[PDB]
Amino acid sequence: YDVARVRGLHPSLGDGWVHFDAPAGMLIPDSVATTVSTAFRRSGASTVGAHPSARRSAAVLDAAREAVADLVNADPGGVVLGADRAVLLSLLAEASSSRAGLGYEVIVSRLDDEANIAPWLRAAHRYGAKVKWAEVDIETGELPTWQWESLISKSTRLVAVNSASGTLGGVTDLRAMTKLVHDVGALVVVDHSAAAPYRLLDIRETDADVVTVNAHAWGGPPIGAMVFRDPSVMNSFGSVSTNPYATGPARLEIGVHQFGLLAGVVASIEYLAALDESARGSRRERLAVSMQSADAYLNRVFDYLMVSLRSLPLVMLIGRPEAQIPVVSFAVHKVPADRVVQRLADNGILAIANTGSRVLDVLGVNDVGGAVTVGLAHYSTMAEVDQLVRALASLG
Amino acid sequence: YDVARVRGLHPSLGDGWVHFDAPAGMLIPDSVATTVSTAFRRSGASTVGAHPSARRSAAVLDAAREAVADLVNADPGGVVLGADRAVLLSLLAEASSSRAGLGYEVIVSRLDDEANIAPWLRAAHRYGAKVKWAEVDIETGELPTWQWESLISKSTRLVAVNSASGTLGGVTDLRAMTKLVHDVGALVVVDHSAAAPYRLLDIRETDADVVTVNAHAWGGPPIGAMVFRDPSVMNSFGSVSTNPYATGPARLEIGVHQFGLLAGVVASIEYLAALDESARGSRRERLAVSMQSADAYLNRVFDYLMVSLRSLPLVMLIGRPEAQIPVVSFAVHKVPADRVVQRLADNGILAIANTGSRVLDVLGVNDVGGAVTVGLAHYSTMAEVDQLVRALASLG
Numbered sequence: 001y002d003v004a005r006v007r008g009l010h011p012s013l014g015d016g017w018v019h020f021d022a023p024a025g026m027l028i029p030d031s032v033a034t035t036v037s038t039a040f041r042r043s044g045a046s047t048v049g050a051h052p053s054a055r056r057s058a059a060v061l062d063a064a065r066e067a068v069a070d071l072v073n074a075d076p077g078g079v080v081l082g083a084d085r086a087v088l089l090s091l092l093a094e095a096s097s098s099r100a101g102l103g104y105e106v107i108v109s110r111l112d113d114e115a116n117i118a119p120w121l122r123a124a125h126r127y128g129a130k131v132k133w134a135e136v137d138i139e140t141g142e143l144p145t146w147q148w149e150s151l152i153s154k155s156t157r158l159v160a161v162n163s164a165s166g167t168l169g170g171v172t173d174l175r176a177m178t179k180l181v182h183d184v185g186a187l188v189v190v191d192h193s194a195a196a197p198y199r200l201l202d203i204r205e206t207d208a209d210v211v212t213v214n215a216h217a218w219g220g221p222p223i224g225a226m227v228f229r230d231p232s233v234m235n236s237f238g239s240v241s242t243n244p245y246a247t248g249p250a251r252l253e254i255g256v257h258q259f260g261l262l263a264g265v266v267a268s269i270e271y272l273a274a275l276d277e278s279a280r281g282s283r284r285e286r287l288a289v290s291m292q293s294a295d296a297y298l299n300r301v302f303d304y305l306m307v308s309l310r311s312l313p314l315v316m317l318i319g320r321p322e323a324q325i326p327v328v329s330f331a332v333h334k335v336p337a338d339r340v341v342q343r344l345a346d347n348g349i350l351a352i353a354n355t356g357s358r359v360l361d362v363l364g365v366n367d368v369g370g371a372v373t374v375g376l377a378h379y380s381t382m383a384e385v386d387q388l389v390r391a392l393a394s395l396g
Numbered sequence: 397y398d399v400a401r402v403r404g405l406h407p408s409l410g411d412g413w414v415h416f417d418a419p420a421g422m423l424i425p426d427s428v429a430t431t432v433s434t435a436f437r438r439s440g441a442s443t444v445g446a447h448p449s450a451r452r453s454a455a456v457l458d459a460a461r462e463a464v465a466d467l468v469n470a471d472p473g474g475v476v477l478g479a480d481r482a483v484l485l486s487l488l489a490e491a492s493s494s495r496a497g498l499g500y501e502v503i504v505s506r507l508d509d510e511a512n513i514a515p516w517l518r519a520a521h522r523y524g525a526k527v528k529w530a531e532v533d534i535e536t537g538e539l540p541t542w543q544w545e546s547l548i549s550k551s552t553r554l555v556a557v558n559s560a561s562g563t564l565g566g567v568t569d570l571r572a573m574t575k576l577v578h579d580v581g582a583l584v585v586v587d588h589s590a591a592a593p594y595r596l597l598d599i600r601e602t603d604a605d606v607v608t609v610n611a612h613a614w615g616g617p618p619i620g621a622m623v624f625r626d627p628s629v630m631n632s633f634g635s636v637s638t639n640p641y642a643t644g645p646a647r648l649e650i651g652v653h654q655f656g657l658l659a660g661v662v663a664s665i666e667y668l669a670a671l672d673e674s675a676r677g678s679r680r681e682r683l684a685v686s687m688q689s690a691d692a693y694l695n696r697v698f699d700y701l702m703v704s705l706r707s708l709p710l711v712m713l714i715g716r717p718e719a720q721i722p723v724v725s726f727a728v729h730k731v732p733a734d735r736v737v738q739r740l741a742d743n744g745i746l747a748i749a750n751t752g753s754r755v756l757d758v759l760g761v762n763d764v765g766g767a768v769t770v771g772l773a774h775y776s777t778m779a780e781v782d783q784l785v786r787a788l789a790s791l792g
Contacts, residue, residue, distance in 0.1 A: 012449075033436060040429060040660075083479035222654045240515075241514075256610070352445075
C-alpha cells in the first residue's frame with residue numbers, strides 16, 4: 001500500500017487542513033469529481049430516446065448497478081439507487097408498513113445511525129407495531145450477541161441493524177442474529193454505510209436480506225444504494241415508481257435518475273478497487289485485494305492513534321471494541337467536545353463534535369459535554385496522527 | 397426575445413438534432429453544467445465544521461432555497477429540497493397520515509403526472525380514505541371548473557392537482573376550487589412541474605398550500621422542491637430529519653443534501669431570469685419579465701406548430717384547451733406512436749412516445765397505437781417546426 005500515491009489522487013489535500021472528519025464523509029478523489037463533471041454535462045434527460053445522450057444515460061445507470069453489485073457481491077438486478085441511504089431506508093419502512101402493524105414487533109439498534117432508526121420508529125408509531133431495542137454493553141459499547149434470543153419473538157417482522165458504528169468504530173457480530181431472525185420469517189436490514197469505506201460486505205455470506213451503503217462515505221457522490229440479496233423479495237414490496245410499467249429495481253426508484261452523480265458512483269467504486277495499484281482481476285477481485293491492502297495500512301495508523309490517545313492523561317476513550325473500523329470517539333476531562341473541536345480547528349485540524357447519537361446518550365457522554373469523533377481515510381498518515389495528538393496534548 | 401442568443405447558451409444545438417422532447421427534460425445550459433462541475437468539487441461533506449468547503453455547502457443550500465422561493469414568490473423558509481418532486485410528494489403523502497384515512501376523501505386529478513397521484517393512492521390504501529377523481533372533459537381535455545362543487549365535500553381533507561398537463565398542455569383553472577377546498581379545511585397541493593419552465597406560479601396570488609417543481613424540467617439538475625405557503629402548515633407535518641435539532645424546512649429533509657446539484661438549481665433559475673437579457677430589477681422581478689417575453693415568443697412558435705399539425709389530415713390532436721403551455725399530444729391515423737417517433741428520429745427529430753399517462757388511457761388513445769408528445773423549449777424555432785411538420789407529412 002502506497003499512501004503517497006493515494007494522496008496524489010486527492011487535490012483537496014495539503015490545503016492547510018488535516019482531516020480527521022472521515023465519518024462525516026471522505027474527500028472526493030479527482031477521478032470522481034472529473035467523472036461527475038463530464039457525465040452531468042453529457043448525460044441525457046432520460047434513458048429513453050434516439051439521441052446518443054439517452055444511450056449514455058442508460059449505460060451509466062446499468063454501470064452503477066453493476067458497480068454497487070460488485071461492492072457487496074450481489075446481482076445488479078437487486079440494486080436500488082437513490083439520493084441517500086436515509087431516503088432509501090425511509091422508502092423501505094413505508095413499503096413495509098404491514099410489518100410495522102398491530103401485533104408485530106420491529107427491532108432497532110441503540111448503536112445505529114438515526115437514518116436506520118427513525119423510519120422504523122416512525123412506521124411503528126403510524127401503524128402500531130411494538131418497538132424493541134438491541135442494547136449496548138455500557139463498558140464496551142458493543143451489541144452483545146447473547147441478547148438476540150430474548151429480543152426476537154414469533155412477532156418479530158423487521159430487524160434493522162448496522163454492520164459497524166460510525167461513532168464508536170465497533171464492527172457488529174450479526175451471525176447469530178441473522179439465523180434467529182430468519183427462523184421467524186423476519187426481514188434483516190443491514191446498514192453497511194459506516195463500514196463500507198473500509199470493509200467489504202459479502203451479501204451472500206452474511207445472508208442479510210437488504211444492505212444499504214452511502215457513496216458519500218468513501219468520497220463518492222451523494223448517492224445511496226439499497227441492495228436486495230434476493231431480487232424476488234422486491235416484488236413483494238409495492239411499487240413506488242411513477243412508471244406504471246416499471247420492472248426490477250426500477251419499481252423502487254422514485255423520480256428522475258441522477259445520471260451525472262451515478263457516473264461518479266462508478267468512478268468512486270473504481271477508486272476503491274484501485275487503492276492497491278498492483279491489484280489484478282475482475283473488479284470484485286481487485287476490490288478484495290485493494291481493500292485488504294488499505295485495511296492493513298490503516299490498522300497500523302489506527303494502532304498508533306489509539307496508543308497515542310491512551311497515553312494522553314486527559315483523554316477518555318468511549319467504548320472498546322473487539323474488531324474495528326478506524327473510527328474512535330473520546331472526551332477530554334473538563335473540556336467539552338465543542339471546545340476540543342474548536343481548539344483543533346485553530347490548529348488546522350478537523351474533527352467532529354458528535355451531536356445526536358443515541359449510544360452516546362446511553363453511555364452518559366452527552367451529559368458531561370459530548371464526544372469528539374475522529375476517523376481515518378485512505379489518505380491518512382502517521383504524520384497527521386502525530387499532529388492531532390500534539391494538539392490534544394495542549395488542552396486542559 | 398432573442399432565440400439566437402438563447403440557442404448560444406446550448407453548445408450542442410445546430411449539430412443536426414432537433415429537440416421537441418422538452419416534456420422529458422430540456423437541455424442543460426452550459427452555465428448550469430459548469431456550476432455543477434465546480435460546486436461538486438468544492439462543496440464539503442456537510443454544512444458543519446471549520447473548513448471553507450462547509451461554508452460553501454451551507455451557502456449553496458441557502459441560495460437554492462432563495463432561488464426556488466423567487467420562482468414561486470414564496471419565502472425561502474417554506475422551501476423543502478430533495479431529489480425530485482416525486483420523492484417530496486411521496487414524503488408529503490406519508491406525513492399526511494390520517495388525512496388520507498377512513499371517514500375522509502382524497503381528490504386526485506386525471507390530468508396529473510403519476511408523481512402527484514401514486515403517493516396519494518398508496519396513502520389511501522394504508523389509512524382508508526375514499527379516493528375521488530377530478531375528471532377531464534373528453535372533448536377539450538380540460539378539468540372543468542364546475543365539477544369541484546360536487547367533488548368537494550365536508551369530508552375532503554387532501555386535494556392534489558396540477559397547474560398544467562405535461563401531456564396535453566392544458567392550463568388548469570384553480571381559482572374557484574381553491575376557495576372551496578379551504579372552505580372545508582382541506583389542503584391544496586399543486587404540482588407545477590410541467591408548467592414551471594414556461595409560466596410563473598405566484599403562491600401568494602393562487603393560495604395553494606403546497607407547490608412542487610422539478611428543476612430537470614427546465615434544464616436544471618435533477619432536484620425537486622416542495623414549497624409551503626405557510627411555514628406554520630409546514631411544521632404541522634411530522635419531522636423526518638435524522639437531526640433532532642432540525643428547524644424549518646430542514647425538518648422535512650432526509651439524507652445528505654446534494655450540494656453540487658443544488659448550486660446548479662440556482663444557476664438554472666438564473667438562466668430562466670435572464671431569458672430576456674434586458675430584464676431589470678430583482679431576480680424575482682426579472683423572472684416575471686423574462687418568462688413573459690419567452691412565453692410571448694413560444695406562443696407564436698407553438699401557434700405555428702398547432703396550425704401546421706391541424707393541416708395534416710392524418711394528425712389527430714388530443715384535447716383543445718382554452719389555455720395551453722407549449723406541449724401537445726397527438727395520434728397519427730392508423731400509425732402507432734413508436735413508428736411516428738422512429739420516422740422523426742430518422743430525420744434527426746426527437747419526440748416522445750408517451751407512456752404511462754392516465755389521461756391518455758382514460759380517453760382511449762392508448763387502446764391501440766398510443767400517442768406522441770412534443771414540447772417546445774426556449775431554444776425552439778420556426779425552422780425546427782417546419783422540419784417536424786415535413787417529417788410527419790411523410791407518413792401515410
